[PDB]
Write a protein that binds this ligand. Structure first.
Ligand SMILES: CCc1ccc(/N=C2\S/C(=C\c3ccnc(Nc4ccc(-c5nnn[nH]5)cc4)c3)C(=O)N2C)cc1
Length: 249
């Protein structure tokens, strides 16, 4: 179906580990989109051809406004290209750097938008690992969009994953706890100056709140960051959580 000659290439929109993403326009439709380039030799150097292949097959079937859409993909002699949804307003990480921290309305809105994306995924038996601000993009109306590779620094990993126990649907809820914290405070809850320490602090769920963090927020974050996965509240319970409904659009 596709080839590189079918597109005009624009400025870079981001740098991945295996290649860059560029703004691009499909020539006949004039459809604006994003295009991720991936080097094949570089892929085989780290042996992830069929880690990535299953990954692509998955998110083709995923359609949700709070998830970045994969329209299609193609290849050539040297590279592999992914056709992506263009997200005009950029990354949340960038927004959080400009603003230092987010207010409660913004935070609660993003959390709701995330929770809805994950509910959709879980309903289709798709689970997600750690979610970083770097991998959250913004659509044209300011809507949050999840963009990364999985889909089924430690700062975002839950205790069960770093301790080498059964990963599970409940990982997602840990991620919401960390993000909700980071949105309000401006840095993640178990940030340390060493990996060894960050590991240790995550395993103990050893973290504290700045004075300004309201008790509604404290409650939600404390409930999501429970060490026992099964004690973390359901996604429905998050969306219903008083502080969420009180602040979210
Ligand atoms: C199919 C799912 C998927 C595939 C590859 C992915 N990896 C990506 S995507 C990506 C960049 C990207 C994708 C879609 N839209 C944008 N929009 C955008 C970002 C920044 C700015 C900006 N302006 N000024 N400063 N920053 C403007 C627009 C960026 C990326 O970097 N990786 C690794 C993620 C998901």
């Amino acid at each position: 179906q596709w080839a590189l000659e079918d597109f005009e290439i624009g400025r870079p929109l981001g740098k991945g580990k295996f290649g860059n993403v560029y703004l691009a326009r499909e020539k006949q439709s004039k459809f604006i989109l994003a295009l991720k380039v991936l080097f094949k030799a570089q892929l085989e150097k780290a042996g992830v051809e069929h880690q990535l292949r299953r990954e692509v097959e998955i998110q083709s079937h995923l359609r949700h406004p709070n998830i970045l859409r994969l329209y299609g993909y193609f290849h050539d002699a040297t590279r592999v290209y992914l056709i992506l949804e263009y997200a005009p307003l950029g990354t949340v990480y960038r927004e959080l750097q400009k603003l230092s921290k987010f207010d409660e309305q913004r935070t609660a809105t993003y959390i709701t938008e995330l929770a809805n994306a994950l509910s959709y995924c879980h309903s289709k038996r798709v689970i997600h690992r750690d979610i970083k601000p770097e991998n959250l993009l913004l659509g044209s109306a300011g809507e949050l969009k999840i963009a990364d590779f999985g889909w089924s620094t430690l700062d975002y990993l839950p205790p069960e994953m770093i301790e080498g126990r059964m990963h599970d649907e409940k990982v997602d809820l840990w991620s919401l706890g960390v993000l909700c914290y980071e949105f309000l405070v401006g840095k993640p809850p178990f940030e340390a100056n060493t990996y060894q320490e960050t590991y240790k602090r995550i395993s103990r769920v050893e973290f504290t709140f700045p004075d300004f963090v309201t008790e509604g927020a404290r409650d939600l974050i404390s409930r999501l960051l429970k060490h026992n996965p099964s004690q973390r509240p359901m996604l429905r319970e998050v969306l219903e959580h008083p502080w969420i409904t009180a602040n979210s659009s």
